[PDB]
Design a protein around this ligand. Structure first.
Ligand SMILES: NC(=O)[C@H]1C=CCN([C@@H]2O[C@H](COP(=O)(O)OP(=O)(O)OC[C@H]3O[C@@H](n4cnc5c(N)ncnc54)[C@H](O)[C@@H]3O)[C@@H](O)[C@H]2O)C1
Ligand SMILES: NC(=O)[C@H]1C=CCN([C@@H]2O[C@H](COP(=O)(O)OP(=O)(O)OC[C@H]3O[C@@H](n4cnc5c(N)ncnc54)[C@H](O)[C@@H]3O)[C@@H](O)[C@H]2O)C1
Ligand SMILES: NC(=O)[C@H]1C=CCN([C@@H]2O[C@H](COP(=O)(O)OP(=O)(O)OC[C@H]3O[C@@H](n4cnc5c(N)ncnc54)[C@H](O)[C@@H]3O)[C@@H](O)[C@H]2O)C1
Ligand SMILES: NC(=O)[C@H]1C=CCN([C@@H]2O[C@H](COP(=O)(O)OP(=O)(O)OC[C@H]3O[C@@H](n4cnc5c(N)ncnc54)[C@H](O)[C@@H]3O)[C@@H](O)[C@H]2O)C1
Ligand SMILES: Cc1cc2nc3c(=O)[nH]c(=O)nc-3n(C[C@H](O)[C@H](O)[C@H](O)COP(=O)(O)O)c2cc1C
Ligand SMILES: Cc1cc2nc3c(=O)[nH]c(=O)nc-3n(C[C@H](O)[C@H](O)[C@H](O)COP(=O)(O)O)c2cc1C
Ligand SMILES: Cc1cc2nc3c(=O)[nH]c(=O)nc-3n(C[C@H](O)[C@H](O)[C@H](O)COP(=O)(O)O)c2cc1C
Ligand SMILES: Cc1cc2nc3c(=O)[nH]c(=O)nc-3n(C[C@H](O)[C@H](O)[C@H](O)COP(=O)(O)O)c2cc1C
Lengths: 335, 334, 335, 334
């Protein structure tokens, strides 16, 4: 299958075109530490043949968590435990990525110091974020840098910056959530400033021969918000510094979105073609047939699976046509 | 979108699935259908297909591919073809007919094999006799007569077969059309035969019933049809027809990279650049891919060929309530 | 597959071990005539590779219909129409069977002459049946004989006598519905008398070289009714005169039955072994896997599929391992 | 019945699916498990398996099949095996261990290979030393010590591997047991080793935890074990053990007709003739067949081997509500 073709990014070779999409498991301690549940969860998909396993949103600071059972990477105790996930996944043949995250105004922890670019709620049930000063923005940029340094020490192959799903970076990017009148707002180049700064600081702390991905929401589905043309502008500002755009949509504010298989694929194809950068497609993809169409029609370079890999962790194994492709221990099960 | 109706002129198709035309090579040498064809098509109507497109049906006996093809070249064929129409409509499908002429790909040894230019389609083929302008006009008349017969048989939709290397395709492609008269040697002249066929069909087909055209959007060869050229042709005809059934290949032997949805980009390009309805076909087998194609607006209909041969009740399996099933089979709903 | 092995019964060779279980389509005229709907319905499963197609319950008298949209074979005019179904199925490679039926007290037609062995309703919604006289029983016996003569003229390969599902013959067989004190009731030999007479009359009118099947209900699931021991006794009385027992259960009176895949298979195996007769198994079998287990473990000689063949008419084709096994017209579709 | 609990002594299995024991050939030469085993078994616990039976675990180093097998012949292996037990129980499964001794089928060329009679398992195998009565006593002791260790590790169920051509099966079969002492000749004598092992395991295994025994109910060879012989053996042990895990073959190479449920008739026969619980195994892959076996009362448990290797969440796929899934995966219910 075309799904089985390796993809080389910098010095990292992904053995096939399937990525496990980052999915929060809400299973960490309030200290943000992974446990044996995480280790088995990720190892299972590495055994299952996934080319690139993207770890769930991992907070760069405690107020950057979505919930108080999220993983974090703000200290060295977390690194020692995250290293266990990395080691077992790579031992079992996967490339290991980490999604560095900051929930911003969508932090749902009742007692946290919730922050954002502008004092506007994400929805009725959320807290009003306090407006970051330029000095505080600098400190969060530094936090993404330190997190990337820690991720390198844990042994991750790939780092992904979470700039999507209505979280902190997305809030700076959208005119609907960013009403600032300083150097971080108004003009498109100013709205991009925080993302650009984060990518720059991550590069200072991440080996030049390892890939950097960025996950984006390519559409807010609202007048005045991000749309595909606006996202193309942003990607053109950063594409010389990053390796692949992980293409998603939505999340800034509640909107009724038409859901169907491949509902985000046109965004992935548009970014790939107009920006000439690698992309990954994600969103209600469950069949080998659709994954093959996406890759063969050059709509994306990687196909990411989320919920399908929750219920069907050996999905990739099922696609193999020879028993020699299976884990040696399971080759008697090839059918 | 899969279960959403599509109205085209006065005809409403109840869902977006079309049974792609597929030759069954089961007729007599007289081109008459039999019980085999009746059951074959009825089965997919029972299976819930929205639009059943009958296999290539020859407008002249020399326009057959084989001597077991269906024909509509004479009035005697109408009463037999009517049996197919009646049973499919009774069982809930819209019925279409693909009007066809095999041209230089006619594989009947004893027939009068014709084409635009005296060039073989391949080694095993007969050299075609080069058509005169008078003979071209006779073939155009034959398409018109076929459309009149189709209307009398009760078909809802007529598709002109302009693809797969057969007669009309042969006029369209520079690789097979070396004519230097009004039917060759410029893009407008190469489209002339198709345009004249469409015009004559329109004179013999009710204005409130749709006309589809199936095209090959790529010859996969330097010098031949490519997507840009097909866009030019579709722009010439789009005010006179209702939907472009998008396919590819057939003119000359070529290697083509095959994968699910390998002709879908052609269907999307035509739909967008020409602002016309299109149908997509080729190695689509899953509800998932069909839904993505329709919902990302890459086509207006999804055609299934081989999947409906092996899995005739494919549409029924997509329904979420027993009330959508044939009443007789209600107790089998999952 | 073992499913693919032929079975010869008398002069008739069934090409595989799959039977389409008889299923009423309630699509006939009030005159009991089939139409194009029946012809397509049965031909589809012949095209689908079914070895033996058993036509739905076909009434031997108009008062023996379940509904007034049932097929009939009570007059010579029905023959030439039924012959259309026979001819198309055989042309497409199937052996064609007909189930000769008489609804007895379960006749649901309000205006019909509803008859039974004893004046006891099948349930609250049914008509009180008229108690048959010995002379009337003789006429119904004659009707089955005339039906078998008609079936032979239509060209059916196999006749099945419907002695199950709470209908007329079953009513004579069960002590719960047969309270007669004449030669047709009040001992096991007397309760079998009607079935035996029907079989003898059918044989008088059915060529010796064509099989006779009998469908039975092997359990009433009620104290005092038929159970497997009683059915073994009945089959022992008829085994020298019939070729295969099509094994079912229930139908006499409303009862809660525990339903699951193969819930009637034990009865088919028990009759097969205890009576040394061929049997067919039916009931909630949908997978090639279960069908193969049944045949390979010698629990039955034929596997009957009902509802599965309604939803999945080409089930048998899907089991084939080669394109040349498929109808020639569909060979390009082999996957 | 599939989702119905089964209580055996004080142990409640939440459903009727057992992961059949399957060697992974991934341990150290010291018989130690590693993170590979922990993930392997944990995955099927997450997958909803009721009873996970750990692969053949050797009660002596010379009782391994290969030098990458798990061992339980020393106290140091206990702490490591406990990691498997703990994670499987935490994730909702009952944990079993198959206690094993390969006998003449030990495939370690340098090991002290032993059997009841000096006869090779095949040309590639080492000639086994014929066990003395005193050495037999010591192996019985080794099974007892293994069970004590298993209890310490926290296993819920112990299974004695008396099948597949290994040590106990070798005593059981006239084809492999040519002894003329108290452990050979008569049926009672051939059963003596198995009976002594069971007694010793019970001395070392809490009275409120169950003991299973896996058997080969047929050698498929004249003069070997057949179902009638196995029924007599089971009748000898049924008052001491809780369930018979029914398999076949393994003593010598033989051709066996393979199909779904090919060992199910052995399971049913033992269950009916001996009035003991049984488990069925062998080419069962569908929910449909598993349900038929359980509901027709042919066995009490259904064991899946190769199906759980390729499809570890098989049980989850049988659930009808999202609440039956691990909380973390609820959004993936379909
Ligand atoms: N860390 C993260 O990025 C995420 C954590 C929670 C879940 N994530 C996504 O947010 C949205 C909303 O999830 P939630 O479970 O909070 O609500 P549901 O819509 O599932 O009910 C709404 N919404 C907002 N965006 C989307 C998209 N892209 N697809 C579908 N629905 C969307 C959904 O698309 C999830 O894939 C993202
Ligand atoms: N009347 C008709 O339009 C057709 C009748 C014969 C078959 N039809 C199509 O012709 C081509 C050639 O089929 P054929 O069976 O003649 O040769 P194969 O190559 O399949 O062996 C090669 N070829 C030529 N065109 C194609 C396309 N479009 N897709 C894939 N392969 C193609 C295949 O795509 C069929 O769907 C078309
Ligand atoms: N002509 C005929 O033999 C049949 C016509 C009607 C349907 N047939 C059978 O009767 C029973 C009850 O039919 P129905 O659909 O009317 O009742 P439901 O309650 O299923 O609605 C109840 N009942 C009675 N018998 C059975 C058996 N054998 N299996 C399952 N359930 C049974 C069911 O097993 C059908 O296969 C039989
Ligand atoms: N620890 C253990 O009990 C096992 C470890 C190795 C494999 N195990 C079983 O041994 C046999 C032989 O396995 P292997 O993979 O080593 O041989 P092949 O499959 O290449 C073969 O295996 C033999 N055999 C022996 N027993 C069987 C059974 N029960 N079913 C099918 N086949 C069997 C049969 O005679 C054929 O010659 C197979 O049934 C496995 O389930 C068992
Ligand atoms: C339980 C769950 C947790 C998720 N957590 C994350 C996350 O940590 N980061 C992220 O970028 N997206 C997250 N998402 C979104 C998925 O990565 C994915 O983009 C989305 O579910 C669409 O793909 P799918 O249809 O294959 O599941 C999550 C989705 C689910 C269902
Ligand atoms: C047996 C067979 C007969 C065909 N006959 C026709 C035909 O009469 N007219 C036509 O336009 N295409 C014909 N084709 C092409 C199909 O309509 C269809 O476009 C092609 O098979 C790709 O779709 P699929 O992958 O769903 O089968 C035929 C294909 C097959 C396999
Ligand atoms: C619509 C329908 C009609 C039926 N008609 C008959 C019938 O005419 N004669 C008969 O013996 N059983 C009849 N039955 C029962 C089936 O033949 C079959 O025995 C039963 O449905 C169990 O098999 P299945 O689970 O494969 O459907 C009918 C069942 C259905 C669902
Ligand atoms: C890789 C592999 C390892 C096995 N190891 C064992 C074992 O340790 N103990 C045992 O009793 N059977 C063993 N067997 C047999 C299985 O437990 C099971 O009985 C057999 O594979 C048939 O069931 P299945 O068709 O569900 O796999 C093994 C089978 C395989 C394929």
């Amino acid at each position: 299958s075309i799904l089985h073709m390796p993809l080389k990014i910098k010095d990292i070779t992904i053995k096939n075109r399937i990525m496990m999409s980052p999915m929060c498991m809400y299973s960490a301690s309030t200290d943000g530490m992974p446990n044996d549940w995480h280790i088995v969860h990720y190892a299972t998909r590495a055994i299952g043949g996934v080319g690139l396993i993207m770890q769930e949103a991992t907070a760069v600071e405690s107020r950057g968590r979505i919930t108080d059972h999220d993983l974090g990477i703000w200290n060295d105790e977390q690194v020692k435990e995250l290293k266990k996930i990395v080691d077992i996944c790579k031992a079992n043949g996967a490339v290991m990525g980490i999604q560095l995250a900051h929930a911003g105004r969508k932090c749902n922890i009742s007692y946290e110091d919730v922050v954002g670019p502008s004092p506007i709620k994400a929805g009725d049930r959320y807290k009003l974020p306090r407006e970051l000063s330029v000095e505080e923005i600098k400190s969060i940029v530094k936090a993404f840098g330190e997190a990337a340094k820690r991720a390198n020490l844990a042994g991750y192959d790939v780092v992904e910056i979470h700039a999507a799903h209505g979280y902190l970076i997305h809030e700076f990017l959208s005119p609907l959530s960013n009403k600032r009148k300083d150097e971080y707002g108004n003009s498109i180049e100013n709205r991009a400033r925080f993302l650009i700064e984060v990518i720059d600081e991550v590069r200072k702390n991440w080996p030049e021969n390892k890939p950097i991905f960025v996950r984006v929401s390519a559409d807010d589905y609202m007048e005045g918000g991000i749309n595909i043309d606006m996202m193309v502008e942003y990607i053109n500002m950063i594409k010389d510094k990053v390796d692949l755009i992980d293409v998603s949509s939505g999340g800034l504010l509640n909107v009724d979105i038409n859901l169907y298989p491949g509902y985000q694929v046109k965004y992935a194809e548009t970014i790939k073609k107009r920006c000439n950068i690698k992309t990954s497609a994600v969103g209600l993809i469950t069949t080998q047939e659709l994954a093959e169409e996406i890759l063969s029609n050059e709509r994306a370079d990687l196909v990411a699976l989320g919920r399908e890999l929750l219920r069907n962790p050996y999905w990739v194994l099922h696609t193999y046509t020879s028993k020699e492709d299976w884990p040696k221990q399971y080759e008697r099960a090839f059918k």
